[PDB]
């Protein structure tokens, strides 16, 4: 229920199903373009599992709306994010965690 805009169209129909290893290569910056994560940097394809409540709810909602080869600007909401608490050290309270993802493979 968050703003999701497709950057690069994949195919759309590849819906990510629960119980799949969603291999992505993503990054993400703050409101002012200040980077706070880049899986491209550490050369790590970030893998996660849907429904298991692994990553926060903004990423968990935007992961379902994508497909294979689809880049997307997951412009998340601070209420859906860590909130008025934030991540203690990395992310201040009330941020817009603008992500930039790319799906690679499923399981």
């Amino acid at each position: 229920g968050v703003e999701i805009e497709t950057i690069s169209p994949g195919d759309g129909r590849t819906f990510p199903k629960k119980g799949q290893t969603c291999v992505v290569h993503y990054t993400g910056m703050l409101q002012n373009g200040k980077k706070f994560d880049s899986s491209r940097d550490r050369n790590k394809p970030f893998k996660f599992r849907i429904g298991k409540q692994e990553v926060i709810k903004g990423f968990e909602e935007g992961a379902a709306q994508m497909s294979l080869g689809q880049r997307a600007k997951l412009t998340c909401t601070p209420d859906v994010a860590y909130g008025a608490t934030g991540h203690p050290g990395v992310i201040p309270p009330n941020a817009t965690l603008i992500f930039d993802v790319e799906l690679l493979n499923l399981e």
Binding site: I7, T27, S38, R71, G89, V90
Partner: protein, 412 residues
């Protein structure tokens, strides 16, 4: 003078106590390093012994009263003889650091008043004095580190927040963090709560590919037009995607300076620059990046065609991709000097030009760059106005400046 007045206050030591204060400081002075190593210790032993005889007579408390009783005004009294208030207060802190610097015995029995000290940290008349008192007491006793609590640190960081940048205040936090040998964890997680996540006060650092723009040797003022095409993008060879922006820019304005003002150089981030081209095609116009869509949300892929145009006598900039409308936005500009295509790029990229040697063109707007080569003026695409020039022997010099389609008859 804490009363009204007396107007004949003979009890006024100013020149006497300031003389002794410059006399007491050197009496506690540390010895220099360029010295015989046995003579260093014998001076040092007399120094450490000298501080302890001041301690048992409680001089630090007797110093501290005179700081208190001078923490009244902010510049007072009969203000001709009391004019030197900035000296006596500032010299009193520099004495107070000298009674401290070496002795653990003098620091711990002092300690007890850092919560008094950081209360006075807001005075900002001689804060660097009262910083220096705080720096020596922290490094010399691990006792006092377990007295300073979180509310003191919030006042410490806020003084760095107001007073610009200091390596002196950072030497506090480096010493506040790790003790003589141990690393108290409660101060470390307290600091990264405050300094880090704001990205507000320190200096944040990054790296992005070098950005360079181009120009086809030709200034441009009928309805002027050009065409572009793309062959190989390969958008990810970085920890970043690449960029592609095409558009127009001025000529008497914004010498091409890469990344000393605006970020990385770029395209469209200056006011003289007006670029376009994005996946979801929206713009860049002087650091603006707002998200006006297009009815494809299409990439800059490895095959697409770019149609760019601007009419004569109409500041009306709008472009096209593959002959498809982009819902153009750029209006209401100014002219001082002519214009040109300003294609920029940062990749292992390769693109074409269409000049004549055209491949595709929509009609509307009828003056290609093929029209701009009528009289004599040649065509060579170069590195966009070139305060530098790249070579291999010696990248040599280039002078500052060497500088209309309506010619002028004399009114005779």
């Amino acid at each position: 003078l804490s009363k009204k007045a007396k107007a004949s206050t003979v009890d006024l030591p100013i020149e006497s106590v300031s003389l002794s204060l410059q006399d007491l400081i050197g009496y506690f002075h540390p010895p220099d390093e360029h010295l015989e190593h046995e003579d260093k210790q014998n001076r040092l032993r007399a120094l450490k012994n000298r501080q302890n005889l001041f301690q048992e007579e409680g001089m630090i408390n007797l110093v501290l009263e005179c700081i208190d009783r001078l923490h009244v005004y902010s510049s007072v009294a009969g203000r001709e003889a009391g004019e030197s208030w900035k000296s006596i207060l500032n010299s009193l802190y520099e004495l107070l650091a000298a009674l401290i610097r070496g002795n653990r015995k003098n620091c711990a029995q002092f300690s007890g008043s850092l919560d008094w000290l950081i209360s006075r940290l807001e005075r900002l008349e001689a804060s660097s004095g009262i910083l220096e008192v705080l720096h020596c007491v922290l490094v010399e006793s691990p006792e006092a580190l377990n007295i300073i609590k979180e509310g003191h640190i919030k006042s410490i960081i806020s003084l760095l927040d107001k007073h610009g940048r200091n390596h002196k205040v950072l030497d506090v936090l480096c010493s506040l963090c790790v003790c003589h040998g141990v690393a108290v964890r409660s101060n470390q997680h307290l600091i990264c709560d405050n300094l880090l996540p704001g990205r507000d006060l320190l200096l944040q650092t990054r790296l992005v590919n070098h950005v360079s723009s181009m120009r086809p040797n030709i200034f441009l003022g009928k309805k002027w037009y050009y065409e572009l095409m793309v062959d190989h993008t390969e958008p990810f060879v970085t920890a970043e995607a690449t960029h592609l922006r095409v558009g127009w820019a001025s000529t008497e304005g914004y010498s091409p300076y890469p990344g000393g003002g605006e970020e990385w150089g770029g395209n469209g981030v200056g006011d003289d620059l007006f670029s376009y081209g994005f996946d979801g095609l929206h713009l860049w116009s002087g650091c603006i990046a707002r998200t006006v869509s297009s009815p494809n949300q299409h990439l800059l892929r490895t095959d697409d065609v770019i149609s760019c145009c601007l009419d004569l006598s109409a500041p009306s900039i709008s472009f096209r991709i593959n002959g498809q409308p982009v819902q153009g936005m750029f209006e209401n500009f100014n002219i001082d000097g002519l214009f040109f295509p300003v294609v920029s790029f940062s990749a292992g990229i390769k693109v074409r030009f269409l000049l004549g040697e055209f491949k595709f063109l929509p009609p509307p707007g009828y003056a290609p760059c093929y029209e701009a080569v009528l009289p004599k003026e040649k065509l060579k695409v170069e590195h966009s106005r070139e305060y530098k020039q790249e070579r291999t022997y010696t990248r040599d010099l280039l002078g500052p400046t060497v500088s209309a389609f309506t010619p002028i008859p004399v009114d005779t």
